[PDB]
């Protein structure tokens, strides 16, 4: 029942009503589970982003635990910070850092990144993934929308709602979870899978950074999923434009066999990442 689920969720959040510890609430966007408001912490004056999501209105309410548990448990230089979380009425509120550089999706819809910029983004995402994968966390929703930027070009992985924490008793999942165009073939097939699915989704995000959109984006989501499931691996449209070293980097991610697919640790050691830039190199994309 709703109250039973609410009581369980309550075990993982900070205690109390946060409404009087915040002011200046302004709605700044919406997302799949709810809204995001900017607000100000009275005690400190710190501006925070607050995700607000109704426990009754979700597709799969159990995934609300991920909104809190993952950032509670896991911290990293390239992972968004959570400050506090609360239950307010029938809503879960999660207080997060406000990243003012926006999402990578809003850059790639405008311009193509150069290779130094692609390597900078990939190195940051791979450091977060190597760390999360080592802890048994599968993200399951890697795509440019999940990548947020600070004003000085620091890259942070966000959107942990679809996460799976695997364990010794259930070391693999088989659920159909993700965003269609970025889902690995083994996820679409409902085969047992683990961390490798995030490497395939990162390869689709590299295609977004080179081409502007993922493969099959003119198809409906189900039709794209059928093509990803059955067809040979997708290619860059702009394959002619990229270095041999970048092409090799991407080829090692978009591999159908999940065992042969590169791990995050393997990719961190790839020569493509020898020419990663400084955070500053992304700042021209945000101004
Ligand atoms: C809304 C918004 N947020 C920005 N900065 C932020 N800083 N911190 C955060 C955001 C947006 N955030 C976020 O969770 N958004 C997702 C959507 N995905 C695609 C990223 C979402 C929102 C509501 C419900 C479910 C999911 C957090 C981490 C709070 C910025 S910067 C310029 C415009 C802008 N507009």
Residue numbers in the entry: 386 to 672
Give verbatim excerpts from the published study on this entry.
The p21-activated kinase (PAK) family comprises six sterile-20 group serine/threonine kinases. We discovered that PAK6 is inhibited by its pseudosubstrate sequence.
These co-crystals diffracted X-rays to Bragg spacings of 1.40 Å and 1.95 Å respectively for the PF-3758309 and sunitinib co-crystals. Good electron density is observed throughout the structures and the conformations of the small molecules are clearly observed. Both co-crystals were obtained in the same crystal form with the activation loop in the extended conformation and residue S560 phosphorylated. The ATP-binding site is located between the lobes and is occupied by the small molecule inhibitors. These co-crystal structures will facilitate an improved understanding of the modes of targeted inhibition for type II PAKs, and may aid future studies that aim to design inhibitors specific to each of the type II PAK family members.
